[PDB]
Structures are given as C-alpha cells and as structure tokens.
Enzyme design. Structure first.
Site, PDB file in Angstrom:
ATOM      1  N   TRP A  42      -7.193   1.571   5.049  1.00 53.29           N
ATOM      2  CA  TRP A  42      -7.233   0.273   4.396  1.00 53.29           C
ATOM      3  C   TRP A  42      -7.590  -0.860   5.349  1.00 53.29           C
ATOM      4  O   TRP A  42      -8.194  -1.851   4.945  1.00 53.29           O
ATOM      5  CB  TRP A  42      -5.901  -0.021   3.702  1.00 53.29           C
ATOM      6  CG  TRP A  42      -5.882   0.495   2.317  1.00 53.29           C
ATOM      7  CD1 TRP A  42      -5.474   1.729   1.901  1.00 53.29           C
ATOM      8  CD2 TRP A  42      -6.422  -0.162   1.165  1.00 53.29           C
ATOM      9  NE1 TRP A  42      -5.734   1.885   0.559  1.00 53.29           N
ATOM     10  CE2 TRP A  42      -6.316   0.738   0.083  1.00 53.29           C
ATOM     11  CE3 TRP A  42      -6.991  -1.425   0.946  1.00 53.29           C
ATOM     12  CZ2 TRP A  42      -6.758   0.419  -1.200  1.00 53.29           C
ATOM     13  CZ3 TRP A  42      -7.431  -1.746  -0.337  1.00 53.29           C
ATOM     14  CH2 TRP A  42      -7.311  -0.826  -1.394  1.00 53.29           C
ATOM     15  N   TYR A 102      -0.087  -8.543 -10.417  1.00 56.95           N
ATOM     16  CA  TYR A 102       0.262  -7.437 -11.294  1.00 56.95           C
ATOM     17  C   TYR A 102       1.655  -7.593 -11.880  1.00 56.95           C
ATOM     18  O   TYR A 102       2.306  -6.604 -12.242  1.00 56.95           O
ATOM     19  CB  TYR A 102       0.162  -6.102 -10.555  1.00 56.95           C
ATOM     20  CG  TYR A 102      -1.259  -5.626 -10.364  1.00 56.95           C
ATOM     21  CD1 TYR A 102      -2.039  -6.114  -9.323  1.00 56.95           C
ATOM     22  CD2 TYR A 102      -1.826  -4.706 -11.240  1.00 56.95           C
ATOM     23  CE1 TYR A 102      -3.355  -5.699  -9.161  1.00 56.95           C
ATOM     24  CE2 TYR A 102      -3.141  -4.284 -11.088  1.00 56.95           C
ATOM     25  CZ  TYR A 102      -3.895  -4.788 -10.045  1.00 56.95           C
ATOM     26  OH  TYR A 102      -5.197  -4.387  -9.887  1.00 56.95           O
ATOM     27  N   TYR A 149      -5.820  -0.463 -19.940  1.00 57.26           N
ATOM     28  CA  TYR A 149      -6.089   0.024 -18.596  1.00 57.26           C
ATOM     29  C   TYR A 149      -4.802   0.172 -17.791  1.00 57.26           C
ATOM     30  O   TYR A 149      -4.646   1.122 -17.034  1.00 57.26           O
ATOM     31  CB  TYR A 149      -7.020  -0.925 -17.845  1.00 57.26           C
ATOM     32  CG  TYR A 149      -7.379  -0.384 -16.477  1.00 57.26           C
ATOM     33  CD1 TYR A 149      -8.324   0.626 -16.336  1.00 57.26           C
ATOM     34  CD2 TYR A 149      -6.698  -0.816 -15.335  1.00 57.26           C
ATOM     35  CE1 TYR A 149      -8.580   1.206 -15.096  1.00 57.26           C
ATOM     36  CE2 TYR A 149      -6.941  -0.244 -14.088  1.00 57.26           C
ATOM     37  CZ  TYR A 149      -7.881   0.769 -13.974  1.00 57.26           C
ATOM     38  OH  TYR A 149      -8.103   1.366 -12.750  1.00 57.26           O
ATOM     39  N   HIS A 189       0.810  -1.208   0.000  1.00 57.86           N
ATOM     40  CA  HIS A 189       0.000   0.000   0.000  1.00 57.86           C
ATOM     41  C   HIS A 189       0.843   1.258   0.000  1.00 57.86           C
ATOM     42  O   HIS A 189       0.393   2.314  -0.432  1.00 57.86           O
ATOM     43  CB  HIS A 189      -0.984  -0.034   1.173  1.00 57.86           C
ATOM     44  CG  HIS A 189      -2.080  -1.033   0.983  1.00 57.86           C
ATOM     45  ND1 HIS A 189      -3.048  -0.892   0.011  1.00 57.86           N
ATOM     46  CD2 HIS A 189      -2.312  -2.230   1.574  1.00 57.86           C
ATOM     47  CE1 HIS A 189      -3.827  -1.959   0.009  1.00 57.86           C
ATOM     48  NE2 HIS A 189      -3.402  -2.787   0.947  1.00 57.86           N
ATOM     49  N   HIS A 248      -8.160  -9.627  -6.193  1.00 52.55           N
ATOM     50  CA  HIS A 248      -7.992  -8.371  -5.465  1.00 52.55           C
ATOM     51  C   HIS A 248      -8.228  -8.493  -3.970  1.00 52.55           C
ATOM     52  O   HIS A 248      -7.570  -7.822  -3.174  1.00 52.55           O
ATOM     53  CB  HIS A 248      -8.890  -7.289  -6.063  1.00 52.55           C
ATOM     54  CG  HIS A 248      -8.315  -6.654  -7.287  1.00 52.55           C
ATOM     55  ND1 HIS A 248      -9.083  -5.983  -8.214  1.00 52.55           N
ATOM     56  CD2 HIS A 248      -7.034  -6.551  -7.713  1.00 52.55           C
ATOM     57  CE1 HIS A 248      -8.296  -5.492  -9.157  1.00 52.55           C
ATOM     58  NE2 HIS A 248      -7.051  -5.821  -8.875  1.00 52.55           N
TER      59      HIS A 248
END
Ligand SMILES: O=C1N2C=C(c3ccc(O)cc3)N=C(Cc3ccccc3)C2=N[C@@]1(Cc1ccc(O)cc1)OO
Length: 192
Positions: free
Chosen positions: A89, A187, A135, A19, A172
């Site tokens: 988060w 990713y 994207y 993060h 995710h």
C-alpha cells in the site's frame, strides 16, 4: 469544497489500522493471507455476478481490480500476508500520488470508473444512494444501510443527490492513501 492533501502518513497507527481492518475483511477464512485469485474471484464471480454486470463490464472491472491489487503487492498464485500488504500500500499510495501530481489517471480512479460503469445503463455516470447500498452489501465493505447513507452525507453530491466518480476518487485518495482527516467517515462507522 477543498483540495486533497497529498502528504502521506504511513507510520500513523490510524492508517495502518485502517488497512489491517480491510485486510482482515478480505481474509475471509482468517488464515492470515490473501491471494489475487481470491480478490479477483470476489470481484468477478461474486460482486459483478450479483450486480448483474455484463460480460464486458465484469471483464473491465476485473482488469482494474487486478491492476489495483498488483499495485499493492498481490499476484496470482501468491500468498500475501499483512506485512507485505501494508508495504504494498505504501508503494501504491506513492505511485498513485505521483500520477495525480502529473495529472495522469490513477489506479484508484480507474477502479472507480469500472465500478460506476456497472450502474450506468442510462448515461448518467453517477451512483445513487440505493445503488451504493447494493454495492455495500454485496461487496461487504458497507453492509450497513445506515453507513451507506452516511457515505452520501459525507460526500459532496451532484445536483441530483447522486455520487460521481470524481468526488469518490477525491475521497478515496484521502481515505486509503493520505489519511486525510476530511475523509474520515467516508464509510460511516463501517471502516475506521
Ligand atoms: O474503494 C473500494 N474498495 C477498497 C478496498 C480496500 C481493500 C483493502 C485495503 O487494504 C483497503 C481498501 N476494498 C473494496 C472491496 C473489494 C476488494 C477486492 C475485490 C472487490 C471489492 C473496495 N471497493 C471499493 C471500489 C471502489 C473504488 C473506487 C471508487 O470511486 C468507488 C468504488 O468500494 O468502496
């Protein structure tokens, strides 16, 4: 195929570093703080504009992005530093995992639905490797044409070699929320 682990690990340096990497990615000017205004502008005036989203799709996507980042603490006209962001988060992860456990749609799933809608002009409801590269580059989360391919290698695709929102939501949850090892590499080498 396996089920997703709901166990969290908010103290793990690996989860915090992930993060932090994203926070820095969102903090363009590197001023140490971001605002919902910047996130929404990135979503609507950059991403949706360049992908050719219709006014309606852009609005739905904005509504989902707004709800998502409000989930982790952001708000219009408010500066959020990493510490608050991380704490945000934890609350979002907890809140979304609670919804998942009750079979209520999660904020992460709803954000996905908005993203997939932009690429759903024929009803397929999926995203192809080529659209994801689009994207990845436009959003900047995965400019590497190579990492996007790894995303598709990492994910379980449908009978057409295409990615669907159900699988991406599964990934995710594990990538952003639970630091599930099965999600590592989602990713490619673009996000640790
Ligand atoms: O998941 C995603 N993201 C996570 C973070 C992010 C940001 C901060 C963090 O600390 C952690 C993660 N940032 C961006 C990029 C973005 C940010 C703000 C506005 C628009 C886009 C982003 N785009 C998504 C959208 C998406 C969502 C669900 C799907 O099924 C498919 C695609 O694609 O992977």
């Amino acid at each position: 195929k396996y089920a997703v682990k709901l166990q969290t690990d908010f103290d793990n340096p690996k989860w915090i570093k992930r993060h932090k990497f994203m926070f820095d990615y969102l903090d363009i000017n590197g001023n140490g703080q971001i605002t919902l205004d910047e996130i929404v502008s990135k979503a609507s005036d950059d991403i949706c504009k360049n992908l050719g989203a219709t006014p309606a799709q852009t609005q739905r996507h904005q509504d989902c992005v707004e709800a998502f980042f409000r989930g982790c603490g952001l708000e219009y006209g408010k500066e959020t530093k990493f510490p608050e962001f991380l704490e945000g988060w934890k609350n979002l992860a907890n809140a979304d995992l609670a919804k998942w456990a009750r079979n209520e749609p999660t904020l992460i799933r709803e954000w996905g639905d908005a993203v997939f809608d932009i690429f759903d002009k024929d009803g397929s409801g999926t995203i192809t490797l080529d659209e994801w590269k689009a994207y990845g580059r436009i959003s900047g989360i995965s400019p590497s044409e190579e990492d996007c391919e790894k995303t598709f290698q990492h994910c379980d695709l449908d009978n057409s070699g295409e990615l669907d929102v159900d699988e991406m939501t599964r990934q995710h949850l594990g990538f952003w929320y639970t630091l599930d090892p099965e999600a590592d590499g989602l990713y490619g080498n673009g996000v640790p």
